Symmetry: C4
Subunit: 484 residues, 4 copies
């Protein structure tokens, strides 16, 4: 018993707490910080608080559905099954209320959770305690036992007191918002998907309560001869037929499809219909808003590529380039980026050295390992040099190197067919894994032959400036290269 | 009296005026600039203009609600209570009209508020004076006293003249837009929240006026036998039942739920219904628009993080990296950024030197103060050197330093467990607050031991290039470091 | 006559053509390029084409409103007023059709407008000529005169032929889209405002045509006993009562408020109601879409400032800074940027040298002209040096300079109160227009006194590195500075 | 036969596969990788799989429209035409099911498609096989032949079994999403246009099925006296009148226009109406969402230009520039960018050397070829130097060069009129194709004359720093320039 009884009320070492406090030593400091603070204090991130709030979510989603129906469509709440259900729930929500004095609290300051018991009690008794209190105690039964020391008046007034329980929706909202921030910090939740499912739960709950209110107001007026229950001649129907019609009216007002069987006739039905129409029209506008925010997040990568490309069309149309030249540019962007939008330089700068090294070795080691230098050189040298290679793409017919031009760069074939075209011989084809232009290294001069693309070529290259920038840090390899 | 009487009509030194004009000397220049301009001129930003416009907002939101009801649902406006309410309001709106000749005006030029009395009078008499004038004077009572020197015709025409007061909505719009720009400049208002509450006020006001117009047109036609008031048999009901039904019709047309008890029969009811449907359908489309603009601002930080990350998935899927390597990258981004999106370099560049110094000393002074150099060095030196430290994160199993590699950097542990793993001894653990790699400073060579992460490590580091860039400005500290 | 008759058919020198072709010599080349091309060819950007299309817009918005009403709600189109209106309009739309062989055309290639008469005729006769042709000729009257060489059948079929005129909506769309691109290139139109007014015109036009179709189908069936016109007992009403009810039905289906007096009974009324509901529900969804795109453009500057600031909250909450330090940062951003978002460096880089010079002289010449160097120096020197000054802001209590620190910068007060606080004397206040720290210029050493902000200070500064970078280009001024 | 029979089941060399695998040698490796894997295995990207899925799309869009109608509005499915249609379709969907064991599969890992036959069979039998199986076999006819070894009960239950075919919508969704990703990789599809047409197909299909369900529930209850079919007295109407009314009800609930002839009376009609209202209200909210995402993509270039410009208004209003200076800046942006937004530096950096060379030679070779140096120099020199030219724009009255200032740059006229204004002579005009300021090259000094813009000038320029940076790579041209 005791070894778990103290262990449950303080932060366990887990994927949330290690990512939140930063290390097991920071978690174990926070465990010590509550274990010194007082008797039975509960940390906000504790497993006890998780499983307790999980019981509250089940308990509240039960109560906020059952209570409106029990008050509205049944004769009395004084029978044994209703006395049992209400005393069970009220004692549970009163245990939750006293635990909100022993539990700590978080803040936007991101500082360590406030865990002094007097600091918790003084903050709670100001912030939320009054709405938690009047909805925890059985205000209707404690009024009734006082009224026991006409009957058609006291029962009605009692039904109005019984609905003070619906303020438990504040706890449902609070406890949902607390655990969704904890799931964001652990399970990579999409914000728009979380947000729309919160609104869907509220729309169903408001539509259910409205579907009670539309019958409750006639009942509190003793079913006047001009209201919808009397006009539809269903005052004596079953509780399920009445609930189905009252929910159908509420949902019809919420979606603006119609009023029910006819438009309102009495003052009560006019003003309850208009309240329902406004709560509906606002929920549906907020739902169309959330559906739009969701849909605009889903294809964000496609969208950003379309916006990026359209600025190339603005550039080409400002410069008034001819349509065949625009087709080369359009075709180049499709081969180089393949509809994927990213920034290679920005992404590699925020990685660490081990991840940059691992991604570069995966991309380029199979291409470089065929070369006679890199087959013999040190691993701590080639892994440094591969980080300097720049990716390039060439279209068919383009010259990659021209004879007689100064050779500032040398290249490696990743994909496609190239052709060396010196006048001294028949043309030699080059293919994936081969390399060319190497005679630019550690020398100077014009290129001895031209090279051109016979198909879409995907290449890697490095400049003699970047090659020298590497070799300046590896003078032993510089001496080995200078020999041949 | 006199010391306040001149003080109220010119800009006070306060959080708005000091932020607007830039200093107390610029405010006191503007006070002098109105005190020299003429008798009783009012500066736009004055406390007198604030409290006067605040009285106008209360006066207008009263009048624009009461006047449509008084004209539409009551027999005559010639009785003592209506003569009192209209003469009180009309004299107040006429004082407001003459004060709009003495008050200055702002411009999009952002230049000093136009405060010459002839320049104010010539600008106002062109821009808005005519709509302000015909809605300030009691056009109905001055028509009636002339008509007094058939009765069923003159009363009707009088009801149409009494609604020229509704042009006071132009002043309500103008004065709201002026004070909301001043609150934006003082209380950090969210623009979408301000914008949606402006539209909500207009939707309620238009829905109220429409709910009058739907009854007013039948009344001006003497309740013809084919209109909704006659068909519903409520020409003799109370003013409250008639208003409740007419508002219910208007609101039903505005939300497109239905027509009321039946579809229109007469020409008057057809064309008023269609006008109402169009004003409704446009307000509801504008409201769904504002709700969408609001919702898309609320999770902007989450959204931007999701969009930033999805470009890493585009990068990884273009390079066709294997799924286990993608899991290392996904796990690295969660530990390094924790779902927070920001640019450290961009944010620190727009701060001033005191704030950069204060943020850097808060982050790093507790880590650096354990070091033997920085425990002895000058405070104006260490505060400069801390600005060069770069934050890094390492996953478990990654090598932070390799034995025999060139040591270009040295590090400090902020969080996590590292292990030094030289072959000369058993492995030594390192933890938060410790430091390693220091032998790279003021020397050259390969690293004497390897160091690796046993858990997620959060580190700070500085390169020997940045260390030298600091020490070049502090040659006295350079001599102290060169000794040991 | 002749001097205008050739001048109207070719591009005039105006704000559009000079901005489109780039100069008066490029416009005069384009005038020559049409004057050589053939007899009476019309350039797309000509004044004749503008005023002709303006006549077509008035002619089409008349015809597309009048023709549906004339066919639907009147007994016959063979009477003199309808023969006159149709022959006047058909001959005008046939002149427009032959002018579309003589007018040139633009392209997405942005190349010079296609102006060869055979190249225009071959392109038009493929692209749009068939829809333009069958809607220009009077197909109904040429069918009727052939049918003249039972009456209840031929009149009905004639009403169906008369609606081939509604294909003139293709010309209305084409000519609107051409002139809106020309107004974008001249009058700084907001795209969302233009787009929403195009949709509003289409919604009104579709709603008007639907309101004809709902009556036309019953009329072509000879008013069957189960359709809405028969059930409402209005087959013998006036044309205006019938049109008002049929428009009310159409608009009710378009906005989804209801069906009219009752739901459909016949097959004709079911399928026309469902067609109307679908065209409505799609127009209203497209309108809520355009209203959202409009609203999200209007506060784009506020929005971007809120998004920029929230990344500072992500930075502060990642670094876990304390709430008082966050209040200094929040207060600093409000004083430095005042809710305005911009990039000073990006905006100044895309201006030209004259505009950079003019903006810098407006901001800084009044501050620099009090200085003893800049009161005596050359104007071509000080105008260069002012471009190096960097703007800074300091909060109250912050030290701008510390005694004994190395002075890398010197400053100028634009606004606020500073205080010099050397131990050798009582404190001296400094105010807007004064300057300090000047002893750092052309020397080296520690600062002789500290300086601190007593109120929010707005300052300009330049580093000794930037001062030297200027003076290296002005050695004559360097010699003058070296003397004192 | 055989030469095509093996060729159809493996990736052909085409615009998709060459862009996906990267080259013809990578495609031919993938062909070999399936040809070695087993008997008759099908690659996901094969032509056989394309034409088979195209037959499935036609087969499914037929079946999912016909089957609900056949079950709902006809007496029995045991007659010869229905036995033929169901056995033809069920055997086709069973061939599709066995082919899903022989076809490979793709993954988010982007690795080569999983093509081992045991790895395909074990993955499919877990993922989707059960929903594919119960919808391929004729579950209703195999139940009926067992029940053949009361009639009003067995037929009803049979109609419920016949709708297990509607699970073929999962295959329709899967096969559409597979081929749309392949069309994105080949035909430059806009994502929002693709997405909205997927939703439009689902809205029509759900509305059709709902329009069956609204009649099916009454039919399964044997048309009770309180349901809509009985109240409208149409139990004996034709199948087309019943379908038209049931579709009209469903579509009315989907769009929230009304219930049909009257609101529900029975429990069955209440709960089916509310199900329809919810499925409708959610589809319409998702459609308004997609229409908004579409509309916001269409004018993305206009939008981004408006947002870019409004930051210039924030800059000007922060600096409080006067209105005439703002008009120069506003006018400059319109002449320099012409409403086109792009980044010249970012776009040219992601192109290759051949495209940069081709775009630069198109823009600038006609301007440079008039110059006496560039008419004589090497083509490999001038093509390098043209890449250094920076575009500039000047407003009328602005000085481009001032006499006596240091000449760091020289210019070329692309468009507009300039004037040289030395005091030694009458003013000389300069026009498109001319050049000035050339005496700054290979020397030093103050400018011998001023030059100013008489009209909007569009210019190119290069600095002496960039000219020297070019000539340092071409010492042979440096010697030729040094001679004159
Ligand atoms: C009472 C008298 C009223 C008449 C006065 C009004 C006349 C003024 C007419 C102006 C015509 C302007 C048309 C400009 C067209 C621009 C392009 C456009 O109008 O594009 C949006 C329409 O496109 C859509 O969405 C339409 C959606 C249809 C959906 C088909 C079913 C699925
Ligand atoms: C008159 C005859 C008409 C029949 C002709 C039309 C046949 C053409 C069928 C095409 C099928 C295409 C389906 C493609 C599916 C793509 C994904 C998708 O369709 O995703 C959006 C639907 O998802 C949703 O929103 C649905 C929302 C349901 C909400 C559940 C309750 C909460």
């Amino acid at each position: 018993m005791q070894r778990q009884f103290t262990s449950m009320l303080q932060p366990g070492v887990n994927k949330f707490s290690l990512r939140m406090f930063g290390s097991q030593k920071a978690v174990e400091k926070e465990q010590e910080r509550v274990k010194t603070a007082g008797f039975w204090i509960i940390h906000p991130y504790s497993d006890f608080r998780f499983y307790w709030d999980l019981i509250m979510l089940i308990m509240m989603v039960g109560n906020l559905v059952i209570i409106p129906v029990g008050i509205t469509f049944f004769t009395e709440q004084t029978t044994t099954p209703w006395i049992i259900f209400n005393v069970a729930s009220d004692t549970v929500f009163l245990l939750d209320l006293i635990m909100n004095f022993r539990t700590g609290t978080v803040n936007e300051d991101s500082s360590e959770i406030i865990l002094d018991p007097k600091v918790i009690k003084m903050n709670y008794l100001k912030s939320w305690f009054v709405v938690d209190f009047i909805s925890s105690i059985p205000v209707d039964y404690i009024f009734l036992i006082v009224e026991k020391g006409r009957a058609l008046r006291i029962v009605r007034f009692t039904k109005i007191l019984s609905l003070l329980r619906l303020l438990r929706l504040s706890r449902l909202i609070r406890y949902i918002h607390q655990w969704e921030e904890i799931f964001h910090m652990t399970y990579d939740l999409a914000s728009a998907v979380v947000r729309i499912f919160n609104l869907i739960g509220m729309m169903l709950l408001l539509c259910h309560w409205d579907g009670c209110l539309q019958f409750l107001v006639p009942l509190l007026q003793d079913f006047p001869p001009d209201c919808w229950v009397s006009l539809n001649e269903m005052v004596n129907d079953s509780w399920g037929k009445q609930y189905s019609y009252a929910l159908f009216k509420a949902m019809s007002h919420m979606l603006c499809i119609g009023y029910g069987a006819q438009a309102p006739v009495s003052m009560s039905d006019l003003w309850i219909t208009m309240l329902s129409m406004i709560v509906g029209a606002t929920c549906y506008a907020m739902f169309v808003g959330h559906a739009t925010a969701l849909i605009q997040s889903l294809d964000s990568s496609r969208r950003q590529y379309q916006e990026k490309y359209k600025q190339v069309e603005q550039y080409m149309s400002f410069h008034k380039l001819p349509a065949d030249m625009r087709q080369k540019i359009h075709d180049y962007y499709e081969h180089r980026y393949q509809g994927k939008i990213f920034d290679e330089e920005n992404i590699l700068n925020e990685l660490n050295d081990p991840l940059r090294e691992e991604i570069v070795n995966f991309n380029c080691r199979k291409l470089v390992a065929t070369m006679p230098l890199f087959a013999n050189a040190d691993p701590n040298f080639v892994t440094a040099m591969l980080s300097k290679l720049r990716f390039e793409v060439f279209q068919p017919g383009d010259y990659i190197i021209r004879e007689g031009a100064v050779g500032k760069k040398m290249y490696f074939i990743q994909h496609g067919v190239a052709g060396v075209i010196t006048k001294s011989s028949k043309e030699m084809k080059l293919t994936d894994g081969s390399y060319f232009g190497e005679i630019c290294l550690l020398t100077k001069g014009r290129r001895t032959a031209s090279v051109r693309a016979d198909t879409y070529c995907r290449l890697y290259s490095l400049s003699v400036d970047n090659f020298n920038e590497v070799l300046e840090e590896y003078p032993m390899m510089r001496r080995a290269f200078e020999t041949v």
